[PDB]
Design a protein around this ligand. Structure first.
Ligand SMILES: Cc1cc2nc3c(=O)[nH]c(=O)nc-3n(C[C@H](O)[C@H](O)[C@H](O)COP(=O)(O)O)c2cc1C
Length: 334
């Protein structure tokens, strides 16, 4: 099974709590996380793009860097880990993304890929006058389909004459082309998003589910496999989890309860043994190092599942204990 880190490009990472660690997104902090992840042989690092926050006491995700420039900086100070940036396809013309991808290909020595998203949060776009209208909800995958067509032409041949409902290329040129086949990833959950992934992506990110129910995502992995049958391409599922680990189950539980007890209620209204809104109801693994190792091995046994994307309650020490105490107990990592 492959392991990735979801880098905190937004303040406070993925916890919405006055009891969680408080921190701004900085290059230097992201550099330390990624270099540490590479040291423990994490396979990849991914950053999202979030253009509007949720406010509250913690000003949650009011502070966010930009994904491509962050990942270019990170590529420059690593050498082995795969590096993925997110393109919000409403905000960048495909030929720019094309050239940015070739650029970070040059920086990393062929370790860069791109996560393509439609966007769905109207305020992110309307705040700057570029929301296309409420039709986009149902049509966004048609839009992304044209978008990826243009990228593929440009990476593939260095030119495009594509013409459709949303783009017109008249001998558009982008060169150099990537030194290695350019990876595309997607995060579609719906039927239409999974069909997109099956056609054009190298793998599909989905959500882990529940708290200490590591296999509860299995029906999503099953749908993605079905979608992949329709194109006969090998597109596996990578699953997002939060890891809250400690020396014992008891201690990890105490940490999780403390976070939830500090829930930033105001930030949470803007947004909206069960999951909690404090980490946006993300699939959560809470336990001793050994317990988490076991649940991750349970994840590796789900048909479809090729990897996990990890967040932590604290990234610098979370990566540490992952490398030192969790990874070494994992069958799927030996
Ligand atoms: C790991 C992960 C990362 C994501 N990153 C972003 C992002 O950076 N920007 C964004 O607008 N959406 C992001 N999304 C949301 C998805 O691209 C997608 O729109 C959503 O899961 C809904 O499914 P659908 O688009 O097929 O309806 C992310 C989703 C996942 C699972």
């Amino acid at each position: 099974m492959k392991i990735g880190v979801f880098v905190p490009i937004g303040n406070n990472g993925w916890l919405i709590s006055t009891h969680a660690p408080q921190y701004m997104p900085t290059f230097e902090l992201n550099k330390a996380i990624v270099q540490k992840a590479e040291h423990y042989h994490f396979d990849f690092a991914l950053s999202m793009i979030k253009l509007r926050g949720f406010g509250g006491k913690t000003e949650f995700w009011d502070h966010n860097l930009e994904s491509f420039t962050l990942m270019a900086g990170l590529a420059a100070v690593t050498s082995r880990i795969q590096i993925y940036a997110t393109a919000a396809t409403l905000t960048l013309p495909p030929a720019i993304v094309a050239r940015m991808a070739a650029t970070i290909d040059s920086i990393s020595g062929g370790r860069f890929g791109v996560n393509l998203v439609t966007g769905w949060q109207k305020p992110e776009y309307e705040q700057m006058g570029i929301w296309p209208g409420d039709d986009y909800f149902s049509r966004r995958y048609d839009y992304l389909t044209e978008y990826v067509q243009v990228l593929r032409d440009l990476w593939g041949t260095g030119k495009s004459d594509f013409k459709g409902d949303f783009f017109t290329m008249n001998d558009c040129r982008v060169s150099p082309q990537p030194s290695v086949p350019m990876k595309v990833i997607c995060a579609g959950q719906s039927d239409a998003g999974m069909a997109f992934s099956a056609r054009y992506a190298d793998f599909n990110f989905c959500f882990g589910k529940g708290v200490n129910t590591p296999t509860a995502f299995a029906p999503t992995a099953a749908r993605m496999k079905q979608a992949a049958e329709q194109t006969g391409r090998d597109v596996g599922s990578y699953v997002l989890f939060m890891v809250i680990a400690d020396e014992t189950d008891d201690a990890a539980r105490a940490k999780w309860e403390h976070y939830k007890a500090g829930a930033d209620e105001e930030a949470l209204s803007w947004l909206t043994d069960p999951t909690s809104a404090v980490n946006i109801n993300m699939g959560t693994l809470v336990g001793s190092y050994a317990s988490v190792a076991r649940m991750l091995d349970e994840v590796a046994s789900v048909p479809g599942a090729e990897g996990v994307l990890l967040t932590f309650d604290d990234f610098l020490s979370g990566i540490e204990t992952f490398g030192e105490r969790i990874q070494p107990l994992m069958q799927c990592r030996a």
